Design a protein around this ligand. Structure first.
Ligand SMILES: [Mg+2]
Ligand SMILES: [Mg+2]
Ligand SMILES: [Mg+2]
Ligand SMILES: [Mg+2]
Ligand SMILES: [Mg+2]
Ligand SMILES: [Mg+2]
Ligand SMILES: [Mg+2]
Ligand SMILES: [Mg+2]
Ligand SMILES: [Mg+2]
Ligand SMILES: [Mg+2]
Ligand SMILES: [Mg+2]
Ligand SMILES: [Mg+2]
Ligand SMILES: [Mg+2]
Ligand SMILES: [Mg+2]
Ligand SMILES: [Mg+2]
Ligand SMILES: [Mg+2]
Ligand SMILES: [Mg+2]
Ligand SMILES: [Mg+2]
Ligand SMILES: [Mg+2]
Ligand SMILES: [Mg+2]
Ligand SMILES: [Mg+2]
Ligand SMILES: [Mg+2]
Ligand SMILES: [Mg+2]
Ligand SMILES: [Mg+2]
Ligand SMILES: [Mg+2]
Ligand SMILES: [Mg+2]
Ligand SMILES: [Mg+2]
Ligand SMILES: [Mg+2]
Ligand SMILES: [Mg+2]
Ligand SMILES: [Mg+2]
Ligand SMILES: [Mg+2]
Ligand SMILES: [Mg+2]
Ligand SMILES: [Mg+2]
Ligand SMILES: [Mg+2]
Ligand SMILES: [Mg+2]
Ligand SMILES: [Mg+2]
Ligand SMILES: [Mg+2]
Ligand SMILES: [Mg+2]
Ligand SMILES: [Mg+2]
Ligand SMILES: [Mg+2]
Ligand SMILES: [Mg+2]
Lengths: 63, 51, 77
RNA sequence: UAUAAUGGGUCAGCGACUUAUAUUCAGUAGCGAGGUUAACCGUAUAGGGGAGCCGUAGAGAAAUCGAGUCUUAAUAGGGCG
RNA sequence: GAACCCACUGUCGUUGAAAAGCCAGGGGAUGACUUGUGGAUAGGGGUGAAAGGCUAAUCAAGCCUGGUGAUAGCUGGUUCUCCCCGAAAGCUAUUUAGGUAGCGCCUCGGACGAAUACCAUAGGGGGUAGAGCACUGUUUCGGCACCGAUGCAAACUCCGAAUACCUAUGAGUACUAUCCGGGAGACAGACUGCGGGUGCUAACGUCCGUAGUCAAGAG
RNA sequence: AUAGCACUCUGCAAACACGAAAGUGGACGUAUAGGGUGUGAUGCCUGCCCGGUGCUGGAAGGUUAAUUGAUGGGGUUAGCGUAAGCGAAGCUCUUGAUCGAAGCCCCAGUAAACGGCGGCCGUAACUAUAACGGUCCUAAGGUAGCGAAAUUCCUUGUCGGG
RNA sequence: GAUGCAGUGUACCCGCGGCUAGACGGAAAGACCCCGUGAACCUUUACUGCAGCUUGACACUGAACUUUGAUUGAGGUUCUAACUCUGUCCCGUGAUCCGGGACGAGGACCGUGUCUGGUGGGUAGUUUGACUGGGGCGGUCUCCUCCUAAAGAGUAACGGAGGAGUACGAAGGUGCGCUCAGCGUGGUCGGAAAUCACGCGUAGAGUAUAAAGGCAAAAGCGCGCUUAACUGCGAGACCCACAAGUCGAGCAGGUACGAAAGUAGGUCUUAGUGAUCCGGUGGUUCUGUAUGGAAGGGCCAUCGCUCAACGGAUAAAAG
């Protein structure tokens, strides 16, 4: 049968030209104690690690 | 016990910082001067409940 | 039972670049809990007493001054 | 593991990595900035059928632009290209 | 106390004559008694003077057929031939510890080349072995907390190697290093030598570091 | 298991049980009868405790469901406003004023209901006894009778009989 | 724990009747012990459902009097027509079923349907951690400092010793300024010890807190003014399985202190901490299912976990 996407992973990863991008953790709450440097540097997207790319591709066959 | 509070800008921008204080040693509402990125100036921020 | 059994995680302090090595600006030279080494020319000190290069060049260690402190500096060209 | 650890009294016959679908990577063949049909029709492996799929462009959550886009007051810097 | 109904003791038998018996003894024997025939109660139900007893040699939930080829990180098995290369029993995390995943270690294809290694010179920072009281502890004898002689220390240091380790040049000898992809296995180790904790300076004991061999290697 | 004894439920279309219902047993019986529970001929008899849980009888104060819907806030436009904006009525989203029983919180009774019948000090030394006196607690701190016992660790406790 | 290995001793080949010392003899994939995120049955004040029982609202459900409250409700007294009788008499009939008719006794009660609070091991499905010189009991599970640790990094044990789950609008920034402690002398109550003055040696003091590494341009101690405890970033590097963590020159905007060169992106540093999901609050040039709006969603900033079994299997579980 057709391969089925893992929707949880599909809602966390998006494809780039040569890889995948993701958001960073530790920016949901408990924010007062954190430093301004951490606050500004954890904002935005980053790339998926090579040791995780295989798992991401296996979970998302069509993205 | 140090309670969390938020300091809101007086310019109406809605900008706010967050910090903590000791209620007993500082009963009065805190009031400081800080930079406001929305208007890019320094203005007074006053304490508001962290909620 | 035993009251002991605790220890902290490692911190990996030490010297990262030795004398005669080429370093570009920004490289960390020493990771130290205290200022066992001091910063000379073209070397900056951080909040945790880390020493880093502020210019390109070659690392060098020395001992100078009345107190006899150990200094580390970067020589440019 | 000679082990005093397991299994077999002997012979003959039977006894265990398969099938469908989807996907990815290597070989080989056709065509080639293009490649290719599905259901179906069809005195039927032919010939018709271009709906559709892959490739040819990225960035951004998105509106939006586009060899550039995102962030920013910034024509600076930086991330993806 | 016979028939009849039971089953208290002992020998025998226990691939028996018998999937519960024989033999010699034992208890009740007009009663809450024994027994024939035909009926009723059906499975989380029945019945039980109550032992979880019995319900067709089956009972802490009968049997048969279906879901069904249930699931088992567990145990076992896995069938012809030759050639080339060749591991691991580690770290991290885990309701995790005899499972699994990322990394480390194996193999095949492509790209790339000496950018890699051995050794010689040159530049580097140590706080161990040893040694010693200058600090911190502890220790023996003398003279008035100190002074003169004397000892000790993983958590003492006025000192301080050999080895290891990082860099730059260089002769020779080695298709070495590095990158991109396909496929794995493995995450129970053992002994010996050296430095150690633990134990009794015991254990073919146990836990680490570091080399060799076995594992997977005959003579 | 048993005859005997005690508690408790049941006024009959009885309680109780079976059944999905219809109905059936109880019983063609009826409080001297029927069900449940504990004990177990007979003799002498059966001490104290209602603090806990249960059951029984009280009280209408606090708390509380469905239901009901008083207010308050918002969306949308007819119309107003150079603009920003304001905005009736009709629909619509949300809030929950008031009313609202049993049960529980509260008060008494009940142990042949489930249950409970103590500590620490001076002394007893022959293991640890309210033995006896102090005090601390508790609802209270064992009456009769018996006791190295089908109950005793020390234990083959001590003395006598055989 | 040896017929089968090494060295030795003994022993011509094969039956029959006896015996049970060994072949870790046969018989049953150990019932004891441990393990698997296995099973069954039983218990309860383990968790979560259901039956049963019970409370009230609406419906079946009607009519008359009468009292009290702010046209309407809540209580009392009667009635019959809904409805009940496992009461009597007739008919179907030849029948203790049933149906129809009459009578009698009850009666808007009881009872039933839907909704709803309480009770509920009576039944049903499940849960009840791991490491451990076997398991159990005990102890531990995350973070920081020292020693084991063999002079780079890293390195185990239910190995030897201590700390943490904070504090601070000043204990932060800057300009200026100043140095501890212990001793010897003499001085009012004043004396080992508290206050004053002079002197010799001199970092033992101190650094909010455990220890280590540090601290004279003092990182120790005061004063004046202040909010750089900023916004957007960020060359480069450390450490790393991932997720994370750490240091950072320099560039723009605004700012504080300095005469100026300049210093300032919290505090001498290393502990004072929690991912994802789901929700709350403030902004927003985004989106918003015919169209214009609006609900809802997205982005930015923030709030709610002793998820301490601290990479957190559920919102919810003991024997
Ligand atoms: Mg958020
Ligand atoms: Mg061998
Ligand atoms: Mg064998
Ligand atoms: Mg085995
Ligand atoms: Mg066999
Ligand atoms: Mg065969
Ligand atoms: Mg007979
Ligand atoms: Mg019998
Ligand atoms: Mg007789
Ligand atoms: Mg039944
Ligand atoms: Mg049977
Ligand atoms: Mg069962
Ligand atoms: Mg080979
Ligand atoms: Mg190995
Ligand atoms: Mg877990
Ligand atoms: Mg296992
Ligand atoms: Mg294995
Ligand atoms: Mg030594
Ligand atoms: Mg393992
Ligand atoms: Mg292992
Ligand atoms: Mg080992
Ligand atoms: Mg061993
Ligand atoms: Mg060999
Ligand atoms: Mg009895
Ligand atoms: Mg009696
Ligand atoms: Mg002879
Ligand atoms: Mg013989
Ligand atoms: Mg015999
Ligand atoms: Mg043998
Ligand atoms: Mg055997
Ligand atoms: Mg077995
Ligand atoms: Mg057992
Ligand atoms: Mg199940
Ligand atoms: Mg365990
Ligand atoms: Mg143990
Ligand atoms: Mg060390
Ligand atoms: Mg080291
Ligand atoms: Mg070393
Ligand atoms: Mg969740
Ligand atoms: Mg619309
Ligand atoms: Mg954990």
């Amino acid at each position: 049968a057709k391969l089925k996407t893992r929707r949880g992973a599909a809602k966390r990863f998006k494809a780039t030209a040569n890889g995948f991008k993701r958001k960073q953790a530790f920016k949901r709450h408990i924010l007062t104690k954190k430093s301004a440097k951490r606050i500004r540097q954890l904002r935005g997207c980053v790339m998926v690690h090579v040791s995780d790319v295989a798992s991401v591709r296996r979970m998302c066959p069509y993205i | 016990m140090r309670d969390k509070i938020r300091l809101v800008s007086s310019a109406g921008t809605g900008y706010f910082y967050t910090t903590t204080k000791n209620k007993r040693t500082m009963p009065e509402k805190m009031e400081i001067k800080k930079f406001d990125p929305k208007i890019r100036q320094h203005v007074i921020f006053k304490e508001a409940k962290i909620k | 039972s035993t009251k002991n059994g605790r220890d902290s995680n490692p911190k990996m302090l030490g010297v990262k670049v030795y004398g005669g090595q080429t370093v570009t600006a920004g490289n960390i030279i020493v990771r130290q809990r205290g200022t066992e080494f001091h910063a000379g020319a073209n070397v900056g000190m951080g909040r945790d007493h880390t020493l880093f290069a502020t210019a390109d060049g070659v690392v060098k260690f020395e001992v100078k001054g009345q107190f006899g402190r150990r200094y580390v500096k970067v020589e440019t060209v």
